[PDB]
PDB file of C-alpha atoms in Angstrom:
ATOM      1  CA  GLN A   1     -10.218   1.971  35.658  1.00 12.66           C
ATOM      2  CA  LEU A   2     -11.480  -1.953  35.537  1.00 10.77           C
ATOM      3  CA  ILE A   3     -11.827  -2.837  31.859  1.00  8.03           C
ATOM      4  CA  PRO A   4     -12.774  -0.796  28.768  1.00  5.52           C
ATOM      5  CA  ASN A   5     -16.076   1.496  28.623  1.00  9.49           C
ATOM      6  CA  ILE A   6     -18.010   0.396  25.962  1.00  9.46           C
ATOM      7  CA  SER A   7     -21.538   1.915  25.881  1.00  7.12           C
ATOM      8  CA  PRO A   8     -24.072   1.262  23.058  1.00  7.17           C
ATOM      9  CA  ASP A   9     -24.122   4.171  19.761  1.00  7.52           C
ATOM     10  CA  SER A  10     -20.415   4.560  20.850  1.00  2.43           C
ATOM     11  CA  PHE A  11     -17.515   6.072  18.068  1.00  2.00           C
ATOM     12  CA  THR A  12     -13.894   6.029  18.540  1.00  2.00           C
ATOM     13  CA  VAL A  13     -11.676   8.648  17.141  1.00  2.00           C
ATOM     14  CA  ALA A  14      -7.848   7.811  16.738  1.00  2.00           C
ATOM     15  CA  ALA A  15      -4.468   8.748  15.310  1.00  2.00           C
ATOM     16  CA  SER A  16      -1.158   7.509  15.167  1.00  2.00           C
ATOM     17  CA  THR A  17       2.172   8.382  13.846  1.00  2.00           C
ATOM     18  CA  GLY A  18       5.079   6.617  12.094  1.00  2.00           C
ATOM     19  CA  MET A  19       6.128   4.679   9.344  1.00  2.00           C
ATOM     20  CA  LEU A  20       5.714   3.775   5.876  1.00  3.03           C
ATOM     21  CA  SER A  21       8.138   1.379   3.709  1.00  2.00           C
ATOM     22  CA  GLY A  22       7.302  -0.904   0.261  1.00  3.38           C
ATOM     23  CA  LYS A  23       8.242  -1.628  -3.167  1.00  2.81           C
ATOM     24  CA  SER A  24       6.834  -1.325  -6.489  1.00  2.00           C
ATOM     25  CA  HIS A  25       7.115  -2.677  -9.755  1.00  2.81           C
ATOM     26  CA  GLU A  26       6.668  -1.290 -13.360  1.00  5.04           C
ATOM     27  CA  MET A  27       6.158  -3.569 -15.820  1.00  7.20           C
ATOM     28  CA  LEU A  28       5.640  -3.569 -19.806  1.00  7.28           C
ATOM     29  CA  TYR A  29       5.758  -7.251 -21.018  1.00  7.52           C
ATOM     30  CA  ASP A  30       5.674  -8.168 -24.919  1.00 11.49           C
ATOM     31  CA  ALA A  31       2.043  -9.237 -25.488  1.00 12.49           C
ATOM     32  CA  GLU A  32       2.847 -11.747 -28.017  1.00 14.27           C
ATOM     33  CA  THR A  33       5.029 -13.583 -26.017  1.00 16.91           C
ATOM     34  CA  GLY A  34       4.417 -13.077 -22.364  1.00 18.11           C
ATOM     35  CA  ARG A  35       7.896 -11.884 -22.282  1.00 18.28           C
ATOM     36  CA  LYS A  36       9.183  -9.582 -19.765  1.00 16.89           C
ATOM     37  CA  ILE A  37      10.748  -6.559 -21.703  1.00 17.94           C
ATOM     38  CA  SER A  38      11.162  -3.726 -19.331  1.00 19.47           C
ATOM     39  CA  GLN A  39      10.219  -3.628 -15.213  1.00 18.53           C
ATOM     40  CA  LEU A  40      11.047  -0.598 -13.212  1.00 17.52           C
ATOM     41  CA  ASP A  41      11.266  -1.665  -9.037  1.00 16.71           C
ATOM     42  CA  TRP A  42      10.786   1.681  -7.213  1.00 17.22           C
ATOM     43  CA  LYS A  43      11.272   1.867  -3.484  1.00 18.69           C
ATOM     44  CA  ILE A  44       9.595   3.730  -0.945  1.00 18.82           C
ATOM     45  CA  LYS A  45      12.467   3.315   2.000  1.00 18.03           C
ATOM     46  CA  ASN A  46      11.379   5.843   5.329  1.00 19.49           C
ATOM     47  CA  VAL A  47       8.008   7.847   4.332  1.00 20.30           C
ATOM     48  CA  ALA A  48       6.562   9.743   8.180  1.00 21.83           C
ATOM     49  CA  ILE A  49       3.043   8.919   7.535  1.00 21.88           C
ATOM     50  CA  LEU A  50       0.217  10.080   9.476  1.00 20.38           C
ATOM     51  CA  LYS A  51      -2.880   7.623  10.433  1.00 18.20           C
ATOM     52  CA  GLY A  52      -6.252   8.369  11.368  1.00 18.21           C
ATOM     53  CA  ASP A  53      -9.591   6.050  11.947  1.00 16.73           C
ATOM     54  CA  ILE A  54     -12.979   7.212  13.441  1.00 15.68           C
ATOM     55  CA  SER A  55     -15.413   3.644  14.005  1.00 18.66           C
ATOM     56  CA  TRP A  56     -19.155   4.126  15.019  1.00 21.28           C
ATOM     57  CA  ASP A  57     -21.224   1.140  16.488  1.00 20.98           C
ATOM     58  CA  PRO A  58     -24.718   2.186  15.640  1.00 25.37           C
ATOM     59  CA  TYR A  59     -25.647  -1.220  16.442  1.00 26.44           C
ATOM     60  CA  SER A  60     -23.897  -4.421  18.320  1.00 29.14           C
ATOM     61  CA  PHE A  61     -23.147  -5.836  15.933  1.00 31.27           C
ATOM     62  CA  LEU A  62     -22.552  -3.385  13.176  1.00 31.53           C
ATOM     63  CA  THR A  63     -19.601  -0.852  12.871  1.00 34.05           C
ATOM     64  CA  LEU A  64     -19.104   1.684   9.898  1.00 33.01           C
ATOM     65  CA  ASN A  65     -15.035   2.660   9.565  1.00 34.99           C
ATOM     66  CA  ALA A  66     -13.565   5.415   8.114  1.00 34.61           C
ATOM     67  CA  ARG A  67      -9.436   5.668   7.805  1.00 34.94           C
ATOM     68  CA  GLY A  68      -6.852   6.859   6.037  1.00 34.38           C
ATOM     69  CA  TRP A  69      -3.198   7.673   6.480  1.00 35.35           C
ATOM     70  CA  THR A  70      -0.868  10.273   4.541  1.00 34.61           C
ATOM     71  CA  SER A  71       3.205  10.535   4.456  1.00 35.99           C
ATOM     72  CA  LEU A  72       3.802  14.099   5.790  1.00 37.65           C
ATOM     73  CA  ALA A  73       5.970  15.070   3.270  1.00 36.44           C
ATOM     74  CA  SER A  74       8.204  13.589   0.926  1.00 33.72           C
ATOM     75  CA  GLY A  75      10.272  10.608   2.111  1.00 31.97           C
ATOM     76  CA  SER A  76      13.357   8.035   0.639  1.00 33.27           C
ATOM     77  CA  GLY A  77      13.442   6.163  -1.935  1.00 34.76           C
ATOM     78  CA  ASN A  78      15.069   4.082  -4.861  1.00 33.76           C
ATOM     79  CA  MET A  79      14.935   3.046  -8.679  1.00 31.38           C
ATOM     80  CA  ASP A  80      16.080   0.710 -10.506  1.00 31.38           C
ATOM     81  CA  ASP A  81      15.252   0.417 -14.269  1.00 29.47           C
ATOM     82  CA  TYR A  82      16.231  -3.289 -15.643  1.00 27.97           C
ATOM     83  CA  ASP A  83      15.525  -4.394 -19.455  1.00 28.02           C
ATOM     84  CA  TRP A  84      15.878  -7.506 -21.098  1.00 27.06           C
ATOM     85  CA  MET A  85      16.300  -5.936 -25.351  1.00 26.70           C
ATOM     86  CA  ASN A  86      17.759  -9.524 -25.858  1.00 23.01           C
ATOM     87  CA  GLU A  87      15.309 -12.082 -26.755  1.00 24.64           C
ATOM     88  CA  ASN A  88      18.090 -14.460 -27.419  1.00 22.79           C
ATOM     89  CA  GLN A  89      19.011 -13.807 -24.068  1.00 23.45           C
ATOM     90  CA  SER A  90      17.745 -14.227 -20.083  1.00 23.53           C
ATOM     91  CA  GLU A  91      19.532 -11.780 -18.706  1.00 21.99           C
ATOM     92  CA  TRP A  92      18.403  -8.215 -18.799  1.00 20.94           C
ATOM     93  CA  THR A  93      20.617  -5.979 -20.596  1.00 21.26           C
ATOM     94  CA  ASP A  94      20.048  -2.733 -19.186  1.00 21.41           C
ATOM     95  CA  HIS A  95      19.854  -1.776 -15.606  1.00 23.03           C
ATOM     96  CA  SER A  96      20.089   1.992 -14.723  1.00 26.28           C
ATOM     97  CA  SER A  97      20.614   2.936 -10.887  1.00 23.09           C
ATOM     98  CA  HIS A  98      18.755   5.839  -9.022  1.00 20.26           C
ATOM     99  CA  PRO A  99      19.380   6.068  -5.489  1.00 22.26           C
ATOM    100  CA  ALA A 100      18.360   9.199  -5.428  1.00 21.38           C
ATOM    101  CA  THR A 101      14.319   8.881  -5.564  1.00 24.60           C
ATOM    102  CA  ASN A 102      11.862  10.900  -3.733  1.00 21.73           C
ATOM    103  CA  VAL A 103       8.963   9.286  -2.980  1.00 22.91           C
ATOM    104  CA  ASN A 104       6.552  12.848  -3.339  1.00 20.58           C
ATOM    105  CA  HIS A 105       3.334  11.585  -1.266  1.00 19.52           C
ATOM    106  CA  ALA A 106       1.604   8.679  -0.951  1.00 21.72           C
ATOM    107  CA  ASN A 107      -1.732   8.263   0.939  1.00 25.15           C
ATOM    108  CA  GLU A 108      -4.775   5.590   1.401  1.00 24.15           C
ATOM    109  CA  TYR A 109      -8.573   5.706   2.610  1.00 26.25           C
ATOM    110  CA  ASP A 110     -10.509   2.601   2.944  1.00 26.02           C
ATOM    111  CA  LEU A 111     -14.259   2.971   4.078  1.00 27.88           C
ATOM    112  CA  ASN A 112     -16.160  -0.207   5.518  1.00 28.07           C
ATOM    113  CA  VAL A 113     -18.340  -1.772   7.408  1.00 27.74           C
ATOM    114  CA  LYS A 114     -17.766  -4.725   9.459  1.00 30.99           C
ATOM    115  CA  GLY A 115     -20.708  -7.396  11.014  1.00 33.37           C
ATOM    116  CA  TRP A 116     -19.848  -9.331  13.511  1.00 33.21           C
ATOM    117  CA  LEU A 117     -20.941 -12.609  13.957  1.00 32.61           C
ATOM    118  CA  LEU A 118     -19.492 -14.251  17.200  1.00 33.49           C
ATOM    119  CA  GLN A 119     -19.043 -12.378  20.017  1.00 35.49           C
ATOM    120  CA  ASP A 120     -18.057 -12.818  24.003  1.00 35.91           C
ATOM    121  CA  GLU A 121     -16.449 -11.293  26.989  1.00 35.44           C
ATOM    122  CA  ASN A 122     -13.810 -11.313  25.498  1.00 34.02           C
ATOM    123  CA  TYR A 123     -13.289 -12.437  22.034  1.00 36.20           C
ATOM    124  CA  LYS A 124     -15.405 -10.984  18.963  1.00 35.58           C
ATOM    125  CA  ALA A 125     -15.035 -12.490  15.358  1.00 34.60           C
ATOM    126  CA  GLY A 126     -16.606 -11.209  12.162  1.00 35.18           C
ATOM    127  CA  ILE A 127     -16.514 -10.738   8.498  1.00 37.95           C
ATOM    128  CA  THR A 128     -16.066  -7.059   6.716  1.00 37.20           C
ATOM    129  CA  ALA A 129     -15.927  -5.428   3.660  1.00 38.63           C
ATOM    130  CA  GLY A 130     -15.210  -2.646   1.974  1.00 38.32           C
ATOM    131  CA  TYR A 131     -13.566   0.588  -0.463  1.00 39.33           C
ATOM    132  CA  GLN A 132      -9.960   1.428  -0.706  1.00 39.71           C
ATOM    133  CA  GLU A 133      -8.123   3.213  -2.488  1.00 40.48           C
ATOM    134  CA  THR A 134      -3.863   4.002  -2.016  1.00 40.72           C
ATOM    135  CA  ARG A 135      -1.846   6.235  -3.795  1.00 38.37           C
ATOM    136  CA  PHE A 136       2.207   6.790  -3.838  1.00 37.82           C
ATOM    137  CA  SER A 137       4.084   8.982  -6.601  1.00 36.69           C
ATOM    138  CA  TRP A 138       7.819   9.167  -7.287  1.00 35.80           C
ATOM    139  CA  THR A 139      10.891  11.371  -9.045  1.00 36.27           C
ATOM    140  CA  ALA A 140      13.487   9.521  -9.528  1.00 35.88           C
ATOM    141  CA  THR A 141      16.294  12.140 -10.427  1.00 36.07           C
ATOM    142  CA  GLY A 142      20.313  11.497 -11.548  1.00 37.22           C
ATOM    143  CA  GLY A 143      21.342   8.131 -11.278  1.00 36.07           C
ATOM    144  CA  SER A 144      24.016   6.632 -13.398  1.00 36.05           C
ATOM    145  CA  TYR A 145      23.153   3.958 -16.045  1.00 38.01           C
ATOM    146  CA  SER A 146      24.901  -0.165 -17.810  1.00 36.39           C
ATOM    147  CA  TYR A 147      23.603  -0.637 -21.643  1.00 35.80           C
ATOM    148  CA  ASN A 148      23.762  -3.428 -23.548  1.00 32.66           C
ATOM    149  CA  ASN A 149      25.028  -6.194 -20.817  1.00 30.73           C
ATOM    150  CA  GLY A 150      27.526  -3.676 -19.253  1.00 32.51           C
ATOM    151  CA  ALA A 151      29.654  -2.314 -22.168  1.00 30.30           C
ATOM    152  CA  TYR A 152      28.090   1.321 -22.143  1.00 30.17           C
ATOM    153  CA  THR A 153      27.533   3.085 -19.332  1.00 26.17           C
ATOM    154  CA  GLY A 154      27.470   6.370 -17.708  1.00 22.67           C
ATOM    155  CA  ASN A 155      25.744   9.170 -15.302  1.00 24.77           C
ATOM    156  CA  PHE A 156      22.592  11.272 -15.452  1.00 24.41           C
ATOM    157  CA  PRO A 157      23.324  14.454 -14.128  1.00 23.99           C
ATOM    158  CA  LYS A 158      22.689  14.844 -10.357  1.00 24.11           C
ATOM    159  CA  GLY A 159      19.501  16.236  -9.197  1.00 25.30           C
ATOM    160  CA  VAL A 160      17.972  16.653 -12.455  1.00 25.55           C
ATOM    161  CA  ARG A 161      14.662  14.086 -12.690  1.00 23.90           C
ATOM    162  CA  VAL A 162      14.764  11.644 -14.655  1.00 26.90           C
ATOM    163  CA  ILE A 163      10.977   9.802 -14.612  1.00 26.66           C
ATOM    164  CA  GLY A 164       8.396  10.683 -12.506  1.00 26.11           C
ATOM    165  CA  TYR A 165       5.862   7.969 -11.572  1.00 25.61           C
ATOM    166  CA  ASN A 166       2.826   7.477  -9.461  1.00 23.60           C
ATOM    167  CA  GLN A 167      -0.008   4.287  -9.097  1.00 23.63           C
ATOM    168  CA  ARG A 168      -3.498   4.455  -7.591  1.00 24.88           C
ATOM    169  CA  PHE A 169      -5.124   0.948  -6.913  1.00 24.01           C
ATOM    170  CA  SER A 170      -8.998   0.827  -5.917  1.00 23.47           C
ATOM    171  CA  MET A 171     -10.924  -2.359  -4.899  1.00 24.48           C
ATOM    172  CA  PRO A 172     -13.676  -2.821  -3.723  1.00 26.36           C
ATOM    173  CA  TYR A 173     -12.833  -5.801  -0.523  1.00 22.68           C
ATOM    174  CA  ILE A 174     -13.679  -8.406   1.508  1.00 23.06           C
ATOM    175  CA  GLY A 175     -12.308  -9.602   4.852  1.00 25.46           C
ATOM    176  CA  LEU A 176     -12.365 -11.302   8.282  1.00 24.51           C
ATOM    177  CA  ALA A 177     -11.744  -9.148  11.562  1.00 26.07           C
ATOM    178  CA  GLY A 178     -10.684 -10.804  15.325  1.00 25.58           C
ATOM    179  CA  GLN A 179     -10.928  -8.981  18.299  1.00 26.61           C
ATOM    180  CA  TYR A 180      -8.712 -10.791  21.738  1.00 27.99           C
ATOM    181  CA  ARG A 181      -9.408  -9.298  24.667  1.00 28.54           C
ATOM    182  CA  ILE A 182      -8.410 -10.025  28.699  1.00 28.68           C
ATOM    183  CA  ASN A 183      -8.760  -6.949  31.525  1.00 26.74           C
ATOM    184  CA  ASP A 184      -7.239  -3.741  29.698  1.00 24.76           C
ATOM    185  CA  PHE A 185      -5.262  -5.435  26.995  1.00 24.79           C
ATOM    186  CA  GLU A 186      -6.697  -5.569  23.770  1.00 24.10           C
ATOM    187  CA  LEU A 187      -5.494  -6.841  19.866  1.00 23.34           C
ATOM    188  CA  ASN A 188      -7.091  -6.964  17.165  1.00 24.83           C
ATOM    189  CA  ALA A 189      -6.388  -8.540  13.392  1.00 24.62           C
ATOM    190  CA  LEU A 190      -7.920  -8.383   9.892  1.00 22.96           C
ATOM    191  CA  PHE A 191      -7.650  -9.856   7.278  1.00 18.10           C
ATOM    192  CA  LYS A 192      -8.714  -8.393   3.224  1.00 17.25           C
ATOM    193  CA  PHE A 193      -8.991 -10.186   0.352  1.00 16.49           C
ATOM    194  CA  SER A 194      -9.323  -8.478  -3.414  1.00 15.28           C
ATOM    195  CA  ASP A 195     -10.401 -10.115  -6.915  1.00 15.14           C
ATOM    196  CA  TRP A 196     -11.755  -6.588  -7.881  1.00 13.82           C
ATOM    197  CA  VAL A 197      -8.288  -4.665  -7.936  1.00 15.00           C
ATOM    198  CA  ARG A 198      -8.120  -1.393 -10.401  1.00 14.24           C
ATOM    199  CA  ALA A 199      -4.603  -0.802 -10.967  1.00 12.13           C
ATOM    200  CA  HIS A 200      -3.396   2.952 -12.779  1.00 13.36           C
ATOM    201  CA  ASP A 201      -0.066   4.468 -13.392  1.00 14.09           C
ATOM    202  CA  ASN A 202       1.648   6.779 -15.176  1.00 14.46           C
ATOM    203  CA  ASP A 203       5.106   6.959 -16.015  1.00 12.38           C
ATOM    204  CA  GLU A 204       6.654  10.537 -17.119  1.00 15.09           C
ATOM    205  CA  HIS A 205      10.085   9.942 -18.753  1.00 13.18           C
ATOM    206  CA  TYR A 206      11.724  13.551 -18.895  1.00 14.15           C
ATOM    207  CA  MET A 207      14.441  13.129 -20.313  1.00 12.86           C
ATOM    208  CA  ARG A 208      12.813  10.980 -23.328  1.00 12.36           C
ATOM    209  CA  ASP A 209       9.960  12.843 -23.731  1.00 14.43           C
ATOM    210  CA  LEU A 210       7.411  10.361 -23.111  1.00 14.04           C
ATOM    211  CA  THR A 211       4.668   9.445 -20.806  1.00 11.71           C
ATOM    212  CA  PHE A 212       3.244   6.548 -20.149  1.00 13.09           C
ATOM    213  CA  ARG A 213      -0.181   5.238 -18.379  1.00 15.12           C
ATOM    214  CA  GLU A 214      -1.558   1.736 -17.754  1.00 19.40           C
ATOM    215  CA  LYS A 215      -4.309   0.459 -16.227  1.00 19.99           C
ATOM    216  CA  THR A 216      -4.712  -3.449 -15.374  1.00 21.30           C
ATOM    217  CA  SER A 217      -8.609  -4.771 -13.871  1.00 21.59           C
ATOM    218  CA  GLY A 218      -9.568  -7.585 -12.296  1.00 21.33           C
ATOM    219  CA  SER A 219      -6.205  -8.066 -10.279  1.00 21.32           C
ATOM    220  CA  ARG A 220      -5.694  -9.450  -6.603  1.00 23.48           C
ATOM    221  CA  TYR A 221      -5.207  -7.832  -3.176  1.00 25.30           C
ATOM    222  CA  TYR A 222      -4.269  -9.113   0.087  1.00 24.03           C
ATOM    223  CA  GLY A 223      -4.036  -6.672   2.908  1.00 25.45           C
ATOM    224  CA  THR A 224      -3.490  -7.161   7.534  1.00 27.95           C
ATOM    225  CA  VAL A 225      -3.995  -5.012   9.854  1.00 30.71           C
ATOM    226  CA  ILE A 226      -2.483  -5.738  12.996  1.00 28.81           C
ATOM    227  CA  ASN A 227      -2.527  -3.888  16.106  1.00 29.62           C
ATOM    228  CA  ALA A 228      -2.117  -4.245  19.638  1.00 30.43           C
ATOM    229  CA  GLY A 229      -3.078  -2.340  22.685  1.00 31.99           C
ATOM    230  CA  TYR A 230      -3.225  -1.289  26.243  1.00 32.58           C
ATOM    231  CA  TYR A 231      -6.028   1.207  27.724  1.00 32.99           C
ATOM    232  CA  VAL A 232      -4.877   3.239  30.004  1.00 31.12           C
ATOM    233  CA  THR A 233      -8.481   4.186  31.274  1.00 31.49           C
ATOM    234  CA  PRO A 234     -11.793   2.699  30.273  1.00 29.86           C
ATOM    235  CA  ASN A 235     -12.202   5.161  27.365  1.00 29.07           C
ATOM    236  CA  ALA A 236      -7.976   5.259  25.983  1.00 28.83           C
ATOM    237  CA  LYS A 237      -6.104   3.350  24.425  1.00 29.24           C
ATOM    238  CA  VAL A 238      -2.791   3.299  23.676  1.00 29.24           C
ATOM    239  CA  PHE A 239      -1.340   1.516  20.598  1.00 29.09           C
ATOM    240  CA  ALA A 240       1.045   0.164  17.839  1.00 25.82           C
ATOM    241  CA  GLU A 241      -0.431  -1.129  14.358  1.00 26.74           C
ATOM    242  CA  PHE A 242       1.504  -3.499  11.965  1.00 24.75           C
ATOM    243  CA  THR A 243      -0.561  -3.222   8.164  1.00 26.25           C
ATOM    244  CA  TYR A 244       0.785  -5.150   5.224  1.00 25.92           C
ATOM    245  CA  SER A 245      -0.446  -5.443   1.683  1.00 23.88           C
ATOM    246  CA  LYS A 246      -0.149  -6.742  -1.178  1.00 25.45           C
ATOM    247  CA  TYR A 247      -1.555  -5.807  -4.983  1.00 26.51           C
ATOM    248  CA  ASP A 248      -0.482  -8.774  -7.177  1.00 23.79           C
ATOM    249  CA  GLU A 249      -0.005  -7.814 -11.004  1.00 25.42           C
ATOM    250  CA  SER A 250      -1.069   4.330 -23.874  1.00 24.82           C
ATOM    251  CA  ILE A 251      -0.228   0.810 -22.192  1.00 26.87           C
ATOM    252  CA  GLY A 252      -2.600  -1.704 -21.910  1.00 21.54           C
ATOM    253  CA  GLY A 253      -3.948  -5.684 -21.666  1.00 21.94           C
ATOM    254  CA  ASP A 254      -1.176  -7.919 -21.635  1.00 22.08           C
ATOM    255  CA  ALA A 255       1.586  -6.104 -22.191  1.00 23.44           C
ATOM    256  CA  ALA A 256       0.922  -4.284 -18.909  1.00 24.85           C
ATOM    257  CA  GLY A 257       1.778  -5.320 -15.375  1.00 27.47           C
ATOM    258  CA  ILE A 258       0.806  -2.899 -11.960  1.00 27.12           C
ATOM    259  CA  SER A 259       1.866  -3.807  -8.969  1.00 27.26           C
ATOM    260  CA  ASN A 260       2.967  -3.033  -4.613  1.00 21.65           C
ATOM    261  CA  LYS A 261       3.818  -4.505  -1.039  1.00 21.57           C
ATOM    262  CA  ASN A 262       3.801  -1.801   1.614  1.00 20.91           C
ATOM    263  CA  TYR A 263       3.942  -2.230   5.381  1.00 20.17           C
ATOM    264  CA  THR A 264       3.086   0.438   8.390  1.00 22.56           C
ATOM    265  CA  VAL A 265       4.166   0.717  11.515  1.00 26.75           C
ATOM    266  CA  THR A 266       2.529   3.256  14.032  1.00 26.27           C
ATOM    267  CA  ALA A 267       1.866   4.141  17.607  1.00 21.45           C
ATOM    268  CA  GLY A 268      -0.590   6.574  18.749  1.00 21.24           C
ATOM    269  CA  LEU A 269      -4.041   6.783  21.558  1.00 23.39           C
ATOM    270  CA  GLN A 270      -7.561   5.650  19.911  1.00 18.61           C
ATOM    271  CA  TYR A 271     -10.670   7.392  22.325  1.00 20.09           C
ATOM    272  CA  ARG A 272     -13.953   6.481  23.025  1.00 19.68           C
ATOM    273  CA  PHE A 273     -16.941   8.507  22.994  1.00 19.11           C
ATOM    274  CA  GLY A 274     -20.101   7.001  24.484  1.00 17.56           C
TER     275      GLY A 274
END
């Protein structure tokens, strides 16, 4: 006991468990006018996740880090599907609702380096660069629909898959990293940024016998990771961690939009091996 034991050339392993929530958008625009034609909102309500982190400090100023998380199994979601079929009307004309939407899986990994530019007894600050990929998959089942401004309504067959959807975001990124420590308490914060996001999606409209594929390049991402922990021993830190990620926006170029926001909240244990 005392303060944390941090030796040269040491490494850490951490695992945490908790929840993922968020919302993705799947967009179709009229490439000619920029007008939005379709928008599907895909919610992630509660998905249980397991998250891991391994870090190695080969030098006092350099950290190498591999981290990731995965859904433990499918989780709960929701999907709402809007179309603006009337160019002479601002409100959408069609809305389908699918409360019975499953989040089949979600995962992420992030490989990065941190270079510490400022270091003292209680504070650390540096820059980070890395590569990250995140994937989400949903299946919307059953549900109801209102078409033509509510003139026509009805239900999809209960439990039958209607639309399958998956997204993938891949990017190199850069960022800033900070740490504050007093006694046995430690706070880490990271801010991440990219203007180089590559996004892909696949959509299966099972009842229409249609499949869509969209891709966009050069979009923006912002993310943060905040971790607050307590060293119960000099080598073992129990912690809670919050992350937030925003990915800004057959189908290409000006017709496509693919976006996501998500957050995670987890708790776990980090151990440092001298």
